[PDB]
Amino acid sequence: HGERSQEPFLRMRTVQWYDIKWGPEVTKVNENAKITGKFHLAEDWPRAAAQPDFSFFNVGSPSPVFVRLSTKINGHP
Amino acid sequence: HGERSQEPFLRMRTVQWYDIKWGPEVTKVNENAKITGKFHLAEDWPRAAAQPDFSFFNVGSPSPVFVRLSTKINGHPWFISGPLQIGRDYEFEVNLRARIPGRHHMHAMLNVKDAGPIAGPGAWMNITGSWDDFTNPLKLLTGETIDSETFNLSNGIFWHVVWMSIGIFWIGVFTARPMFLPRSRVLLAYGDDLLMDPMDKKITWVLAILTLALVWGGYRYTENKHPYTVPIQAGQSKVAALPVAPNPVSIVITDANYDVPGRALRVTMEVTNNGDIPVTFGEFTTAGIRFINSTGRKYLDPQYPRELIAVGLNFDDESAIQPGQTKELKMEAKDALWEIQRLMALLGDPESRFGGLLMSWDAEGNRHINSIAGPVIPVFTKL
Amino acid sequence: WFISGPLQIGRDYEFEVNLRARIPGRHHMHAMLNVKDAGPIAGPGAWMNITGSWDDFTNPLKLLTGETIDSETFNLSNGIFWHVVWMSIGIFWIGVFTARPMFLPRSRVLLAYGDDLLMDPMDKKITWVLAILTLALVWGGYRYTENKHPYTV
Amino acid sequence: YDMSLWYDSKFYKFGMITMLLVAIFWVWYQRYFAYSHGMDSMEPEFDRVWMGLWRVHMAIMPLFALVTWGWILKTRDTKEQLDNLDPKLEIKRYFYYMMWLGVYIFGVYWGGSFFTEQDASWHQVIIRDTSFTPSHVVMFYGSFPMYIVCGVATYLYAMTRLPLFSRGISFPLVMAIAGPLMILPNVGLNEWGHAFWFMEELFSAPLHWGFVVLGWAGLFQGGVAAQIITRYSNLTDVVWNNQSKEILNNRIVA
Amino acid sequence: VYIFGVYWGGSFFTEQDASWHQVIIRDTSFTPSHVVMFYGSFPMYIVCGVA
Amino acid sequence: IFRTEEILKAAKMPPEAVHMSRLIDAVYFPILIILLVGTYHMHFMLLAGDWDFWMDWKDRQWWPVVTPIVGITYCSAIMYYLWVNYRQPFGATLCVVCLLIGEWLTRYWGFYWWSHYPINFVTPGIMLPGALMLDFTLYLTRNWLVTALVGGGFFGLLFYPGNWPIFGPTHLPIVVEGTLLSMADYMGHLYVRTGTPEYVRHIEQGSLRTFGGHTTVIAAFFSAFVSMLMFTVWWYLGKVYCTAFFYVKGKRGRIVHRNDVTAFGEEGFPEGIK
Amino acid sequence: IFRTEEILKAAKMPPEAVHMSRLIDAVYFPILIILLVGTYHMHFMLLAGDWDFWMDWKDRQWWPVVTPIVGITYCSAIMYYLWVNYRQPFGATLCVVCLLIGEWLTRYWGFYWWSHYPINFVTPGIMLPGALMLDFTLYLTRNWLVTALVGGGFFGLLFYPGNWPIFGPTHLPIVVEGTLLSMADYMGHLYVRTGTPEYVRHIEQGSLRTFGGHTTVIAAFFSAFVSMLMFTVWWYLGKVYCTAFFYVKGKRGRIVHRNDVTAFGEEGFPEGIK
Ligand SMILES: [Cu+2]
Ligand SMILES: [Cu+2]
Ligand SMILES: [Cu+2]
Ligand SMILES: [Cu+2]
């Protein structure tokens, strides 16, 4: 919801996401859910986008419909 | 033309140019020319010069006597500036086209974002013809042929003339009647009631309508004549540096001194040939200046400018360093070319340091390049 | 390491500091690494003892131009001499006016009669002489220093 | 009626044509000696040509200032002559003062507009800015002091031949002249910025913003012209409308 | 008297502080220098000023 | 055909006075023109001349924002001077015309005939429609605050559409060595600038927060908004620039500000002339 | 031998009034001296004291530029006060003398006798010739704008040549561990500053746009130019510093600015004294 507005060249040559799993599809309130995946930082990082020297992995939810119990890049909290 | 003013320590330890070819020497107008070369970014990059994170390869021409058809670092088109790595070697090729006749000194430069210009060697190139015979026919992506010398020339002048005529009419409709003193007296004694003219209101309304209509019409005409246009391009260029060549020669600088009332550079070094074939030093290069001996003279470009070549490279032991041998050498670069390029100016530098490229050759003709740097001590011969 | 420089994280370095005893006493002597924006990073400390007298301290150095000096007493008389000369000139200039009615009578005369009686030709002569002397002294000191030390870095 | 009693323009025309010819000579010198002898600052020919022109400027412009200012101050009007001044002669003298202003403004145009974009033009055909580059010599050492002399001379004339200017201090005129005047010392800021970490690549760089702030003082022409027009209206009332002379000596008294 | 207090606070016991700032690792808050001026000379001249 | 005879009769000028006034105009107006040329040209080139000089600096972010903000300054002050003192509505147009005259003179003699750059590569270009509309707004509204708002909006908005006919054709795409460029970019690369490398261009670069289809539009409004401020500020600066007093002194040697007043502007002076 | 009796007779002072005036001078002048010492010393050390403290901070770029600009400020204001109120031309010299007295006191007692640094390593040094020439210019010209121009030029230009006899010998080269240093640099390294490492020195570093043979000269002119501005600005600040009024109130409780005037300075007061 807004990613298409972002200039292609930028997104296309910044973070290359792959193997992304969302689940479960339908969950009840107070139950656990998981979003897993991998991403490659492209060598052709555009000049417009600054170097990822301070990167935070965020969730693009409509609102806090999910409480982020944890986020782990590789295996580091 | 100005490179000698640049402090030696800086240029000496920034970009080390080598193997630079200019050609053809004499070319006619509308003919092609090329400046090729290589440069090493010295590991002893001075603190004063910023890191080459935004490097643009420029041409030091007297004026645009050549139109830069293309510039390519390694093999990547370098239209947009980009980062370069210190301690790595790069190759450049500049393709140009002759525009203005005359004799012109044509240089290589590397403009760094915050450091500034780093000028290189220069050679005299001659253009024969007429500037009024110059044509640069290009073809656009939309499918139109143009000439870069005469492109969008009548359009801009036409629009300028139209708008300037409108402005001149607007100005001169008032500079045709008493304008400064009687108006001031009437306004200061009677108010602005007599100073407002309905005819001026009609003219103002007509001109405002005309101005808005002209803006809209020009915009629509231009957007109908050229439906497809691209914005001003930006970004950065990126090319992998030349692969590091294996060097059987390892050099450690122990001492270095330069004469303040004189012209000489004396460098004491410890060289180690950890390879398997004898190696003999033949050339010391810095700031485009080259000091050569018989070995260096053996492998020398006959077309390189002779005003930057000095046969003054002397060693205490001018013998080939045998494989697996460590030797103490003392190199002496002495010639009047040091005075022309102001090696003399190291005494007023806030950093007394030397750098350069020492070149060596095998018995079979293979070349090794070592970037050497260190602190130089002043030697006062007058005492 | 006279001039600061960059160091690499995750790498090991060796340091050696050579010093000479100046002031007697017992002193805790540390290692520090001052980083540009981080600040000081102090290290371990040990107590070292100096026995003697601070007035026996001499640090004989030799310059590139060929002169022997002592770091404790170097360019000491020169700076004090020039300071004394210029301060004497300034004190004379100040005190040539702090010898007569200076605040109230001048204010009354200026506020009632203008500055006509407040300008003194003798002060003009003194001003001209002192200006000529000041310019001549600046030029002479510069030329004397540049003739005594032709080579400086 | 008699035009000559309150109007004369020979000096204005001579100054205008002389300034134009000097600018044309500077242009010809630049176009003849810049590419052949102005490329390298260390060459002896660069000295002999461009530093020779710099020395000529440094010897002529102080002479210009001395001659002009001394002539203006030497043929001065005493307080007696400035109190019984013929108002027709006062109109003529105000015309002369406006013409001096015009010469000063022509000098400012030559210095700040023409020989400045010509410098940006030179800044792009050379590796880096020097200090006595062909451009500099003609303006920094030539056009700059030139308009400054005219500016002082302009004020000088006014406060010597115009009683009002000899009476009170024309605040607007002060700034109008001091501005381009103080522009010349800003060459120090220019050089210090170019040589050190204030960058040099842009011509519209922050170190070049001292000139715009100092040249904003040239907009006090509003106050200058307000004074001129007020005096002109008073002189018109006195001379032609047979009004009392008291309006000329009433408002600028203590 | 107030100006003598200001001289003691702002001139003498300030370069003496710069002098202390170079023989210590980093500035503290109650360093020998501070106590005498920040908490001593400073309020001293202030009292005189009000008085 | 305007109402000049009525104005002259209201001013009570004898024919010799009328001729003297005409000579004053003919002497002073060229002086004001030349002063505007010089000072406005210096101000514009040293604040916004870099985007002015070269074709490849005319971008969607900095050129249409920096140029009108710099241009409105002298226009507002000169309009204040002319309108307040003489009721003349041609201030901004005169400023921009003087700036363009100076710019064309320097481009032809400095950039082209001395530095050998082509004329089409150094088109400035125009800023005139905005100044004309600002003058028309000031004349029609007669209020300088409504003029500030509407005319500053016009000045900041009409800059890019008015320059598009000149620099629009320069945006046609070209392919050189397999790389896409705008024709202005290839013109900039073709003609070597020894002192101006590529990386010094303060032009758009794109961002992850940027809507590429709206860039100019946003640049059209921001440049407008600041203009509405700048005008106002410089309008007050006009009152500073029209300050005309003398430092007179007497007796104790005291200096007092004194203003010379127009006798014709007094209460009963015009009636007593006859 | 000057004209003091004539001045006293023009002031109409009885002998007891003359003695009371002499006591006023003897009380107030030391107070002004001490205030200048304190405040000027604080201002100078907290704006330019770092280059002042150490021998190796005295460079060709920042020291001769920062020092005169900081020094001219108090000098201009005190010169305004003295000249405008009492026609006394010794303002700048008095300021610099007070600054040097304070500096020497703190260097001897703070840096040397407490922190054990050598005296020669902390020479400030002088800024006096420029102040003297500024005072002479103000006295001889009697105009504060011509004084601003010429005296600011002198103040910014004479700083480095006047200090060269003191710090010139400190630039002799030495070779330590095969590295070339200035003797000031080796003095700085020899005497450990726990709070001042090498990298904090704001000194010259060279540039690719820099003419090493002209550096000081350029620094001599820039520091001059700003001085010509700074003087002027602080001269106006002097008028702010001499503002002497009272907030009086009456009736509704309204507060009005009131000025106490000198009766002797009135029109006919001196003649009616007799
Ligand atoms: Cu979504
Ligand atoms: Cu060359
Ligand atoms: Cu320049
Ligand atoms: Cu502290």
UniProtKB/Swiss-Prot annotation, chain C:
Function: Part of the ammonia monooxygenase complex, which catalyzes the oxidation of ammonia to hydroxylamine, the first reaction in the process of ammonia oxidation to nitrite.
Organism: Nitrosomonas europaea (strain ATCC 19718 / CIP 103999 / KCTC 2705 / NBRC 14298)
Protein name: Ammonia monooxygenase beta subunit
Additional free-text comment from the UniProt record: The physiological significance of the two gene copies is still unknown.
Domain of life: Bacteria
UniProt binding sites for Cu cation 1: H30
Subunit structure: The soluble ammonia monooxygenase is a nonamer composed of three alpha subunits (AmoA), three beta subunits (AmoB) and three gamma subunits (Cytochrome c1 PetC).
Localisation: Cell membrane; Cytoplasm
UniProt binding sites for Cu cation 2: H28, H30
Consequences of knocking out this gene: Cells lacking amoB1 grow more slowly than wild-type cells, while cells lacking amoB2 grow at rates similar to wild-type.
TM ranges: 79-99, 126-146
From Swiss-Prot, chains F, G:
The reaction(s) this protein catalyses: AH2 + NH4(+) + O2 = hydroxylamine + A + H2O + H(+)
EC number per UniProt: 1.14.99.39
Membrane-spanning residues: 27-47, 64-84, 94-114, 121-141, 148-168, 217-237
UniProt keyword list: Cell membrane, Copper, Cytoplasm, Membrane, Metal-binding, Monooxygenase, Oxidoreductase, Transmembrane, Transmembrane helix
Superkingdom: Bacteria
Cofactor note: Binds 1 copper ion per subunit.
GO cellular component: a single term: cytoplasm
Cofactor annotation: Cu(+)
InterPro entries: NH3/CH4_mOase_suA_sf, NH3_CH4_mOase_A
Enzyme category, top tier: oxidoreductase
Effect of deleting the gene: Cells lacking amoA1 grow more slowly than wild-type cells, while cells lacking amoA2 grow at rates similar to wild-type.
Coiled coil: none
Keyword DNA repair: no
Entry binding sites for Cu(+): D185, H189, H202
Membrane association type: Multi-pass membrane protein
Activity regulation information from UniProt: In vitro, inhibited by acetylene. In fact, acetylene is oxidized to ketene which binds irreversibly to His-189 of ammonia monooxygenase alpha subunit (AmoA).
GO MF: ammonia monooxygenase activity; metal ion binding; monooxygenase activity
Subcellular location(s) per record: Cell membrane; Cytoplasm
Role of this protein: Part of the ammonia monooxygenase complex, which catalyzes the oxidation of ammonia to hydroxylamine, the first reaction in the process of ammonia oxidation to nitrite.
Note in the entry: The physiological significance of the two gene copies is still unknown.
Subunit and partners: The soluble ammonia monooxygenase is a nonamer composed of three alpha subunits (AmoA), three beta subunits (AmoB) and three gamma subunits (Cytochrome c1 PetC).
NCBIfam families, A to Z: AmoA_BACT, CH4_NH3mon_ox_A
Protein name in the entry: Ammonia monooxygenase alpha subunit
Species, as recorded: Nitrosomonas europaea (strain ATCC 19718 / CIP 103999 / KCTC 2705 / NBRC 14298)
Lineage: Bacteria, Pseudomonadati, Pseudomonadota, Betaproteobacteria, Nitrosomonadales
Gene: amoA1
